[PDB]
């Protein structure tokens, strides 16, 4: 791909002149999709959308003579009436419908738009890696088949096999991509309440997800026994069965614990695996690097430690599963155990 370094009308230099148009997309989605550049519900939904668009690719199926999906091809938006009805994709038609208009107005491909919005969404969350953005995804011509996006009730072996088929990702990289549950909430698992976060800092890209999933689960935050849900350690926080089990499985437990108190490994690994997800089904050497359009991510504000135990929790509440290295001794925030506030989603989530 021949790139032509250029200075856009806003005065910024980018690696290719074709990237300049994405500055108008950026300003539009920041004000009109993310309410002023927030790391709130639409940002969270947009990050989730990247994975549900991209992981739907299967070389194993292609080897059996069946279409296995095009990976990061924007199919979930183009064929939203089909894909968003798949149970793993529950609640994603809401964000697809909020995103659709931007695609049509700016004339960008659906796949490139999903990857762009995911990167911009993450750049709005303090602590996020400096995110990449490559263009070049042609519109999907066929919807993905079902059975490709992991469910919260799937076993660890099923999920490991699924991501290995999809992109040759190993079990370590499976843990890295689950860092996105550090900026995320659950709207459709518990039918009585929407917006329960996976960690106590859903607006901060940090390792609280990895700390808090390792604590002993003691209660359900809303109703009990929903499929794919297990007890969590804090009021207001939800824990799903897949994350609970991957944190405790001997193949992935030490990599899961490796992010605790290690911000630079969290940022580097997630930067890497997020980019890889957005290139599934594509030829990296045929894409254009428009990463200079993505805003600079901001640091976490304040002076609290990077990782900590939430108030009322100590090392005694950790279910140690990594046999090679002891869970780190973190500080405990002072005061009484406090509930995690929910993140109400837009209508239809
Ligand atoms: C690998 C297996 C995974 C499983 C089983 C899984 C499961 C889930 C479930 C059950 C929810 C809540 C969905 C709902 O209530 O509608 C969710 C939300 C979310 N997931 Fe995952 N996830 C996985 C991997 C990923 C990955 C790789 C990413 C990102 C690259 C991701 C990003 C998110 C985000 C950001 C949310 C929050 C959505 C919101 O706030 O509306 N997840 N995940
Ligand atoms: Ca797709
Ligand atoms: Ca967090």
Curated annotation (Swiss-Prot):
Binding site for heme b: 181
GO biological process, one term: response to reactive oxygen species
Family the UniProt entry places it in: Belongs to the peroxidase family. Ligninase subfamily.
Cofactor detail note: Binds 2 calcium ions per subunit. Binds 1 heme b (iron(II)-protoporphyrin IX) group per subunit.
Disulfide bonds: 8-20, 19-290, 39-125, 254-322
Natural source organism: Phanerodontia chrysosporium (White-rot fungus)
Gene3D superfamilies recorded: 1.10.520.10, Peroxidase, domain 2
SUPFAM superfamilies, alphabetized: Heme-dependent peroxidases
Residues that make up the propeptide removed upon maturation: 1-5
Comment on pH dependence: Optimum pH is 3.
Active-site annotation: 52 (proton acceptor)
Job description of the protein: Depolymerization of lignin. Catalyzes the C(alpha)-C(beta) cleavage of the propyl side chains of lignin.
Identification of the protein by name: Ligninase H8
Pfam family, one: Peroxidase_ext
Binding site for Ca(2+) 1: 53, 71, 73, 75
Residues annotated as glycosylated: 262
């Amino acid at each position: 791909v021949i790139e032509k370094r250029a200075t856009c009308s806003n005065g910024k230099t980018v690696g290719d002149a074709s990237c300049c148009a994405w500055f108008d997309v950026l300003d539009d989605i920041q004000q009109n999709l993310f309410h002023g550049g927030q790391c709130g519900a639409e940002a969270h939904e947009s990050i989730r959308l990247v994975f549900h668009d991209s992981i739907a690719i299967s070389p194993a199926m292609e080897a059996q003579g069946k279409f296995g999906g095009g990976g990061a091809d924007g199919s979930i938006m183009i064929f939203d009436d089909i894909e968003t009805a798949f149970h793993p994709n529950i609640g994603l038609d809401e964000i697809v419908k909020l995103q659709k208009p931007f695609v049509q107005k700016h004339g960008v491909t659906p796949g490139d738009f999903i990857a762009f919005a995911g990167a911009v969404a993450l750049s709005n969350c303090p602590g996020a890696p400096q995110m990449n953005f490559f263009t070049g995804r042609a519109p999907a011509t066929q919807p993905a088949p079902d059975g490709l996006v992991p469910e919260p009730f799937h076993t660890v072996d099923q999920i490991i096999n699924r991501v290995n088929d999809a992109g040759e990702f190993d079990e370590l990289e499976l843990v890295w991509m689950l860092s996105a549950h550090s900026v995320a909430a659950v709207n459709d698992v518990d039918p009585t309440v929407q917006g329960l976060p996976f960690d106590s800092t859903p607006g901060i890209f940090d390792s609280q997800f990895f700390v808090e999933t390792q604590l002993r689960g003691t209660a359900f935050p809303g109703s009990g026994g929903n499929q794919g849900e297990v007890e969590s350690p804090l009021p207001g926080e939800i824990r799903i069965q897949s994350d609970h089990t991957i944190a405790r499985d001997s193949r992935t437990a030490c990599e899961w614990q490796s992010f605790v108190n290690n911000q630079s490994k969290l940022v580097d690994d997630f930067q890497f695996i997020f980019l890889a997800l957005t290139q599934l089904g594509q030829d990296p050497n045929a894409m254009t690097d428009c990463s200079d359009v993505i805003p600079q991510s901001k640091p976490i504000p304040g002076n609290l430690p990077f990782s900590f135990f939430p108030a009322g929790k100590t090392i005694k509440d950790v279910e140690q599963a990594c046999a090679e290295t002891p869970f780190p001794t973190l500080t405990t925030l002072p005061g009484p155990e406090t509930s995690v506030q929910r993140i109400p989603p837009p209508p239809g989530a």
